[PDB]
Amino acid sequence: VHDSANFIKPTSYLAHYLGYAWVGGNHSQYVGEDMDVTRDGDGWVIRGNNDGGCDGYRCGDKTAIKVSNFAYNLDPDSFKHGDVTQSDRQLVKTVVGWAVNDSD
Amino acid sequence: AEPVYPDQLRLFSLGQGVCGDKYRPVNREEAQSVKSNIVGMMGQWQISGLANGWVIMGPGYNGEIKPGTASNTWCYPTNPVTGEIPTLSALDIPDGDEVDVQWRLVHDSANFIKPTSYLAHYLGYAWVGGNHSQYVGEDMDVTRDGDGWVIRGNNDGGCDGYRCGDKTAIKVSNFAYNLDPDSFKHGDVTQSDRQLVKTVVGWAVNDSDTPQSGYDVTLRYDTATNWSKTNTYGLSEKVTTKNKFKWPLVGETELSIEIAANQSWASQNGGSTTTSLSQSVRPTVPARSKIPVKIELYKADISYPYEFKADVSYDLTLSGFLRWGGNAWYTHPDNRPNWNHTFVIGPYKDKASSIRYQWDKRYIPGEVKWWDWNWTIQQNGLSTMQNNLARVLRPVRAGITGDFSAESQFAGNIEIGAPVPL
């Protein structure tokens, strides 16, 4: 989400092409410039920097781009896991037994 | 583009864009990623120079980043250090019972008491130390409290200072053992207070001319508990009319007519638990022969000794009030509140209890929700914090010998007897 040329710019331009208003910060006039990136909960928010002042109708209502719900398509042979460790072990139940074979 | 650690940032008042050697100016995006940290290290009306003719401003200007120029420049090292917490070699405890190993761990002054006391001090816990010294982590009493241990400054005699009687307490509990897989061994299993549940004896008879494996005897015993709660709410409406008539034969008659309606809503939540134990015997019977079988199920107390070699992890709780002058909690309280925080020394369990996760994520302000480690680095230096945290998170390895014991478990016996010719 901090990749300007590969993420911030194309997504900002897509928002602009669809008709979302004020895609960009107050310190430029180009779409997708002067954007702030913040970590919000489990997602990220990219929004034009609303500092100083702006000229325009409702220029303070910057368009927000939210990134969330990341998923990972794994390469099948690449998964590896380390040691499994257990904590706070509370016994549920146990059984001991004998299996006797008197036959031949 | 690249993560920036605030501790490596430095201001140079050497003119517009002229940093020191081995340092380069910080650009706008890097400054924005760590804006709160940089604005925190600036004067209220201070204006500092970024790269590419940009400028960041102080808290008076809400930390605004805008095109401009200035005389001081924010710079970052050309080859920054990663700042990772080092990994030290394992501390070996002499073998013994679990409580003995815990005892040896919590009475180690150089490897446990000092680093943990220093960690409590760097975070801003007040009065980490006893009354008979002024150094942090000295004159500490260790006591065995229930299933845990308490390390607290010795509050004997008298002390000078504000609320000097409220010593910070360090609690050690919730021990866990990551076993070496090939090291576990157990001794004889012994049973006591055996109460018979049920037995079955049987015969498997084979009159055919070939061996037969198709026999099955199965004894199963199940126990369950259940619970439920129900809340009901009702409403009712009723209308009655009463009149008087002279019916021909019966004479004076009183007639009542009543119409009623009712509505009810009920909500129920419940649950259950079930435990089942099954034993089966499936003998292979030789041709023209018969085999006796027996299954028995008992309830019994079970005991056995065991031993293994393990890595040892534990929960470390810090209790006390945070210093008014400065503490590392992210809101930085100033009213000296009481505070308890638990770390998990060992494998990751969650973010709030993991020192390593917070330390690694200190470059993301939105992730900083419990402890401000950048603040500790600024107060004490990066190398000092690294060394203290490396000693706090040092792995511990020990040989353990113990006894398992449990009451009212299951004891089974399955027997296939000797064949009898037909």
Added chain:
Amino acid sequence: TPQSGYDVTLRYDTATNWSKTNTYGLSEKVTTKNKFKWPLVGETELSIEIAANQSWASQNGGSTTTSLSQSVRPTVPARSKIPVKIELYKADISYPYEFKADVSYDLTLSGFLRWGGNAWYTHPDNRPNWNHTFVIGPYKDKASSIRYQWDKRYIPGEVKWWDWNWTIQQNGLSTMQNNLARVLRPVRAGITGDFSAESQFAGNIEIGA
């Protein structure tokens, strides 16, 4: 070809259950009563009632089930037939047995503790009645284990039943060591006995010719 795909299964289950329920209720009712002269019916008494009720119930229960299953799965030769039989009985069962074993036991002490000095960690001085159980054998719990308490006497926080340091001070380390060694001496014996139980299961599974 020979066929092994046959199955006859007889299963018998018995169960018991129990339940307990506690219920609490509240009710509120408002009634108004009036008199009118309705045209044709004449003098009429009209009652209007509105009620509300609330109820809370709490249930706890349990069950126990015992199941006995017997299956026969004969392998039948080609162009042939085999008779099968399964029987289930309830019966009393008996048999003799013998083995060689180590012998453990519970040892209870009952009496009043001396006023002059006793080894209980609180050291009562009012001569109270006292019963304490030790398990002579494998470990079961801390309170009944002499060896655990003896080994842990170096930790004051673990000293919660008997003060063995006090006994060492009063009598000497070697004396207490020898006495406890004789108390915890293992015992080995040959045992011959009889098993007997009523209302158990007896089965019979038969594959014929």
Added chain:
Amino acid sequence: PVPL
């Protein structure tokens, strides 16, 4: 199958 995928080799490990």
